Amino acid sequence: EVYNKDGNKLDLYGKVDGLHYFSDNKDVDGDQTYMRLGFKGETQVTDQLTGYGQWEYQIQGNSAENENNSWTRVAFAGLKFQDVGSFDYGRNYGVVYDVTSWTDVLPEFGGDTYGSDNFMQQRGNGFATYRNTDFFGLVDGLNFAVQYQGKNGNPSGEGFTSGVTNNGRDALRQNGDGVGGSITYDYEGFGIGGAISSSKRTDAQNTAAYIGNGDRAETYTGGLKYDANNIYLAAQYTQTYNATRVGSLGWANKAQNFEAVAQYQFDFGLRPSLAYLQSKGKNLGRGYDDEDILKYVDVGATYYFNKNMSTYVDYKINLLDDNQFTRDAGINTDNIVALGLVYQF
Amino acid sequence: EVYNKDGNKLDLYGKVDGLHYFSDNKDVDGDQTYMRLGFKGETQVTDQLTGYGQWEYQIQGNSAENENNSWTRVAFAGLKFQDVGSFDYGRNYGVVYDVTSWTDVLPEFGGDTYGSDNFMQQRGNGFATYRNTDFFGLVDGLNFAVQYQGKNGNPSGEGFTSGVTNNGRDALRQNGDGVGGSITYDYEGFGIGGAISSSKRTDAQNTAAYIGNGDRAETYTGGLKYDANNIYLAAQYTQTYNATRVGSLGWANKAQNFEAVAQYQFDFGLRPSLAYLQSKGKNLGRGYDDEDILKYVDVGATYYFNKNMSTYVDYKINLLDDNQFTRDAGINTDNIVALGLVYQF
Amino acid sequence: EVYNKDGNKLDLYGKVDGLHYFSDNKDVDGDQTYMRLGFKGETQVTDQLTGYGQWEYQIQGNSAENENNSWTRVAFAGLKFQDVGSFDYGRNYGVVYDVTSWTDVLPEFGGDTYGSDNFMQQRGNGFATYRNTDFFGLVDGLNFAVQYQGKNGNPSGEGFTSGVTNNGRDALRQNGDGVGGSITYDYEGFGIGGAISSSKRTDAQNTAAYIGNGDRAETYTGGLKYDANNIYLAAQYTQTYNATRVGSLGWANKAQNFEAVAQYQFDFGLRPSLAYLQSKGKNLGRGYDDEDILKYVDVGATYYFNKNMSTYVDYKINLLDDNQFTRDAGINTDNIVALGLVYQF
Amino acid sequence: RSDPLEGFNRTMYNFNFNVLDPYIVRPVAVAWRDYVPQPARNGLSNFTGNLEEPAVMVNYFLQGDPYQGMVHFTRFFLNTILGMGGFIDVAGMANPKLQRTEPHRFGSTLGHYGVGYGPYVQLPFYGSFTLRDDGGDMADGFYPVLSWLTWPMSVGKWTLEGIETRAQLLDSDGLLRCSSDPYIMVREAYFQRHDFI
Ligand SMILES: CCCCCCCCCCCCCC(=O)O[C@H](CCCCCCCCCCC)CC(=O)O[C@@H]1[C@@H](NC(=O)C[C@@H](CCCCCCCCCCC)OC(=O)CCCCCCCCCCC)[C@H](OC[C@H]2O[C@H](OP(=O)(O)O)[C@H](NC(=O)C[C@H](O)CCCCCCCCCCC)[C@@H](OC(=O)C[C@H](O)CCCCCCCCCCC)[C@@H]2O)O[C@H](CO[C@]2(C(=O)O)C[C@@H](O[C@]3(C(=O)O)C[C@@H](O)[C@@H](O)[C@@H]([C@H](O)CO)O3)[C@@H](O)[C@@H]([C@H](O)CO)O2)[C@H]1OP(=O)(O)O
Ligand SMILES: CCCCCCCCCCCCCC(=O)O[C@H](CCCCCCCCCCC)CC(=O)O[C@@H]1[C@@H](NC(=O)C[C@@H](CCCCCCCCCCC)OC(=O)CCCCCCCCCCC)[C@H](OC[C@H]2O[C@H](OP(=O)(O)O)[C@H](NC(=O)C[C@H](O)CCCCCCCCCCC)[C@@H](OC(=O)C[C@H](O)CCCCCCCCCCC)[C@@H]2O)O[C@H](CO[C@]2(C(=O)O)C[C@@H](O[C@]3(C(=O)O)C[C@@H](O)[C@@H](O)[C@@H]([C@H](O)CO)O3)[C@@H](O)[C@@H]([C@H](O)CO)O2)[C@H]1OP(=O)(O)O
Ligand SMILES: CCCCCCCCCCCCCC(=O)O[C@H](CCCCCCCCCCC)CC(=O)O[C@@H]1[C@@H](NC(=O)C[C@@H](CCCCCCCCCCC)OC(=O)CCCCCCCCCCC)[C@H](OC[C@H]2O[C@H](OP(=O)(O)O)[C@H](NC(=O)C[C@H](O)CCCCCCCCCCC)[C@@H](OC(=O)C[C@H](O)CCCCCCCCCCC)[C@@H]2O)O[C@H](CO[C@]2(C(=O)O)C[C@@H](O[C@]3(C(=O)O)C[C@@H](O)[C@@H](O)[C@@H]([C@H](O)CO)O3)[C@@H](O)[C@@H]([C@H](O)CO)O2)[C@H]1OP(=O)(O)O
């Protein structure tokens, strides 16, 4: 908080993380430090209408001084009314990520099932999110929201024709026009959430160079949560059809992923964590059958010195094989252990 | 303003807006969400000397996570005395931009007759501006400025045997050593000003068939403005020789840009707008005799909430016709409707 | 500075510099304005253990709109105890720079004998530096530190299967696992320090395309300082083996760097400067035998208007000659005039 | 005390101060003080003084003055870059102790060790002239920033200082008129104004 004027409350935040990787695989070995910066403002227009905006930038310091690797995580703005809902437009998280974030509580790992700009699963460009609080002021804990996704095609710089958009990207991040919604109910201590999304698939993702062909990408996502007496227990299980990114090969026809976490909070600051993730496929093509995209167990602990500096240790025990499918898709197999500290201001 | 001590005051500023383009042209439609970030700090050395600086950074939030589309707009520093004028060196707008800004009142569109880093028309590098206010404290409203231009040319690291510069770029924004000046007059609502620009052209701009070839690129800019009784009326007619950028073909030998605006802010907050733009090319090369470069009429309105939050709708009616000249240059000839939500802090 | 509550404090800092170079080399001539921005946070965990953070970003303002040139200079975080030392991990300065910083008070042209990520001579990645103040509170002025550097090799994912890391770069700045430490002693005004470094060399730097082949790269540096009676005199001698970079053709097998500085502080703000930099390469494996690399004399002065705004003037006297070795190495051998105007907020 | 050539070179001084002065210099001084705006006069005075700024440092270095020599070093640098070549007195306003002082030409350096003024000779259309101070003033023409000056425009630069000096002295023009012997009064004032500085 650096500004507390009349309806100009600006909260500047950010963090810097210095992390190192110790794995047998040379693809991810070495330093893994990064940095995040952003702000979160809020404007009180009146007693009912209230404007707000959020922004976050990530700058990676792993590269040298001759190159830069930076990207925008979330960038959106909108208005928030009173006891009737709120609407905002820009780069924000999807409705599915609202429920999946309960399980994704690991310090460094976690959330590897989905990828960036992977339909309505993580942060993306052109999201029209409508959020309502307390069900228009009727019940407590019952929150529901809807979202919309724009159509993104090939970049206009190169000649590709067909679907062309100004914010062009690679064929692994293109998406069409879809509509999704979510509804969560939160009681005291416990909590149950669920989301359903369906995004259109562009014509450039149905070629013969990428696995997975279809017209729609409707997904069903569940989840449970429990946060009471310093005990954090959450479980979730999604069912995505032609929406799970295997890697460089393309998208799996049908992949079922189940995640569960178990964390405890101590008085001195230690926060042990334990998670299990599986991404075994069902109807993989190109001769594959019942292949596992990702399967690992994360065990570690987090020590909180204060509200600004935190230390954690994470050990990723990979439980997947090293067959031809793993090498073709470029999936890591060696175990990764990372320890470091992050300072937040 | 987040810091103010011992004379030095820092005033952080910026804006975040989510934009989306709806048009029949596939090269411009899609998400265009960007943001601006910077600070405006100043310090007082003594009672007769004041220092100041300005920085700005534009980051496009519509790009994916594997690429970055961020760039700087203005970055300059200087010192200002009590009343002798003002001098600053760095990245800043040209003297002509101080006059053409009267018609640059549209929220998003407008000002398409010129381009960035195009001689003394927009923000560039190596700009030394000496601006005097109130004519050394003699007559109120009479101001003039003297500017200088560097010798930026071909890139140094591209292995060019001709004149090269460290901050090189493509053969579309290079310019020679030029000196220009402008004079502006103010009154009770009514305003009248003029600008004069003349910059040399590098030898790299006359190698290929760039259509516009000449030793010097003169530019005469004139116009008037009227801001009184919540009524905003202005006009501007410029005659630029080898200064306006046609597109991917080169430069126009003679262009007659004309643009006028008409706004009237209501007491509620609505500010309807109605502007028309025209750009007739003369003495064109490559067989073209007389073809229009830019001709459209823009209509829209904005509604500020309290001081910063505003919602605006734009509708550009392109009156240009598609032909061989427009297809080669790459100029859209179809109507485009845009919607945005700008949040300023 | 901008936020101080609940024991957490922030110190926003940075500068905006508008640079202009006057030289006939055309490789550095032109406007080279840049920008510096960063923060320095600090938290109070308890009465004995404290925390701090430092980050800095450099953005070049001389680029155009279609290109971006920026990099992260320093980014690290860690804790700080009361009287046993402080430990921090991330991007920071090496132990060799702690002795060479006494002669690096030059305004613009200083510390040109080394480079970033060059055998632990400047800012690098994966720097875990532990520093003790006042020798655990025993004596005054005896400061020593020890740090370790990780192994960085070829970039990952581009035709590389050996020496692969996630933070790879070009072979001109690769480094191995090296350990080094420095010890300083400042009793009253006068000071004497030294640093011993030994960094391993990767297999990519031992090829025939670059000069200098060895298992370990040793580096011994010594220096002296004196800051009293409003005068500043310092001198340092550096002896590096396969550590100093010489152009893009590799590294010198044996170099004897010697840098000295001389500055004076006046009551009205003028700070004259004078430096003599000498570096003679020895045992070159390309027929160049004993030559002179990067030899120049720097003379100039700096005027300080206040504690937040200052200006400086520099004049480099290049005594080196233009020969065959200079042509294929890319070494400036002519006088360069540089002027700027910094503004620290 | 006494100076040679007292009877001679005296009638021309009266003519230049009672015929040429009230008919050519005085009429143009009134118009210059009124018609020319005050900011214009200040800018011209600062620009003229900045041209001789890199010459005072050389004079101070010969006699020895590290404190005073560096004072004028930053005055020219700030006025050339941040003052449009001397139009704005950046260094003077930046520090109350860095204001512009009297010009110390080569005559002051020669007088530091002690040099007699010699005979007194009055030059036409110029006023008082001395072999030590005014005679030695033609020594900075070889130094940089001053050798580039051409002969035609150099004459007009001196005339600019005379108009500015005469305009400021219009308020005290009655002191010389009421003096019984203006030649004696103007001789002592010239020697005291220059002295050894
Ligand atoms: C609070 C918000 C929260 C959410 C709100 C509630 C949630 C529900 C809302 C969503 C549900 C809608 C139903 C649906 O979503 O439907 C289904 C899903 C069904 C499930 C239903 C569940 C519902 C859940 C409800 C929950 C309740 C609890 C899937 C689908 O999405 O259907 C798909 C269709 N899209 C829609 O239906 C969305 C839908 C949207 C329509 C847009 C309306 C205008 C926007 C309003 C702005 C709002 C203001 C804030 O429309 C409509 O329903 C009309 C209704 C509008 C309502 C939605 C608007 C949302 C905005 C919200 C903002 C508040 C789509 O069709 C065509 C679309 O093309 C246009 O682009 P272009 O014209 O090309 O530029 C426009 N594209 C857009 O993106 C619009 C825009 O970007 C996004 C919209 C806005 C979003 C951001 C705005 C927010 C910003 C605010 C910031 C503050 C769009 O409209 C247009 O025109 C629009 C027109 O321009 C411009 C309009 C003017 C603007 C005026 C504004 C100013 C007002 C003035 C005020 C003063 C138009 O629809 O494509 C395929 C069809 O396949 C084809 C085809 O045949 O076209 C086949 C193929 O064709 C061939 C051929 O045959 O030639 C075949 C081949 O042989 C071959 O040759 C190829 C050849 O190679 C190339 O040709 O071509 C090929 O061409 C392909 C693609 O083109 C290229 O691959 O498409 C369909 O798949 P399918 O149906 O499943 O099969
Ligand atoms: C408070 C702070 C105080 C201040 C800070 C510190 C101050 C002191 C500095 C440290 C002492 C210096 C000693 C030294 O510096 O030592 C010498 C110098 C001699 C003395 C000089 C003076 C010293 C005293 C000075 C006094 C001053 C006062 C030189 C050298 O450096 O020796 C070198 C060796 N040692 C070290 O590097 C340091 C060192 C290695 C460190 C290992 C310890 C583990 C880390 C501890 C974690 C920290 C705790 C927080 O030493 C060790 O052992 C253990 C000793 C422990 C010390 C390190 C602790 C650092 C922590 C800092 C503080 C936190 C090194 O051995 C092997 C290493 O390989 C692994 O990678 P891989 O996994 O295999 O990929 C791991 N690599 C690493 O980097 C580890 C990591 O990145 C660094 C860690 C620290 C950095 C960050 C810390 C901070 C983090 C953030 C904190 C917030 C590493 O561990 C491993 O196993 C795995 C891993 O760690 C263990 C897993 C993790 C376990 C713990 C984590 C969990 C914690 C639990 C918490 C609850 C393992 O040891 O390699 C070469 C050999 O050459 C080869 C080779 O054989 O490898 C030959 C060649 O091979 C061939 C082959 O085999 O055929 C031949 C070819 O023709 C061809 O065929 C190919 C074939 O195609 C493929 O093979 O390959 C080729 O491959 C080449 C390179 O590829 C190319 O150049 O390398 C040696 O050179 P040489 O001896 O000179 O010849
Ligand atoms: C707020 C202030 C605003 C302004 C204030 C009032 C407004 C008036 C002032 C501006 C207008 C000037 C008039 C004009 O604008 O003039 C005309 C216009 C006509 C009249 C209009 C008047 C309007 C008036 C309006 C009034 C309004 C009130 C056009 C033109 O611009 O003339 C042009 C010339 N003049 C200028 O550019 C500016 C200018 C010349 C510059 C004068 C010296 C610089 C002063 C330093 C600044 C001080 C800092 C404050 O003007 C001058 O005279 C003197 C004036 C001084 C002004 C500059 C300073 C401004 C800063 C002010 C800040 C306080 C220029 O000549 C040559 C120049 O080359 C050098 O580079 P080099 O390194 O040597 O290569 C230097 N280059 C520079 O840029 C200097 C520098 O970057 C700019 C400085 C300012 C910028 C930043 C300042 C602020 C910084 C930050 C501050 C915090 C420069 O100095 C030199 O020597 C060396 C150097 O400076 C000196 C070293 C530095 C010393 C001082 C530093 C230390 C001081 C402190 C110590 C205590 C030198 O003059 O080039 C072409 C000629 O064409 C050729 C040629 O023949 O050379 C043809 C061609 O040749 C051939 C050949 O050889 O045969 C033919 C071919 O077939 C082929 O074979 C090629 C072959 O392939 C390759 O060779 O070669 C080719 O080579 C080409 C190019 O090289 C390559 O394409 O050039 C002319 O075009 P043309 O006349 O139209 O034809």
Numbering used by the authors:
A (entry chain C), B (entry chain B), C (entry chain A): 23 to 367
D (entry chain D): 11 to 207
Q: From the publication, what sentences describe this entry?
A:
To maintain this barrier, the OmpC-Mla system removes mislocalized PLs from the OM outer leaflet, and transports them to the inner membrane (IM); in the first step, the OmpC-MlaA complex transfers PLs to the periplasmic chaperone MlaC, but mechanistic details are lacking. The OM lipoprotein MlaA interacts with trimeric porins OmpC and OmpF, where OmpC appears to play a more critical role in Mla function.
While the MlaA donut sits in the inner leaflet of the bilayer, the channel ridge only protrudes midway into the outer leaflet. A really striking consequence of this placement is the mismatch between its membrane-spanning region and the thickness of the bilayer, leading to local membrane ‘thinning’, where the outer leaflet membrane-water boundary prominently bends inwards all around the position of the ridge. We therefore propose that in the event of perturbed OM lipid asymmetry, bound LPS might be exchanged for PLs, allowing the latter to gain easy access to the MlaA channel through the membrane thinning/funnelling effect.
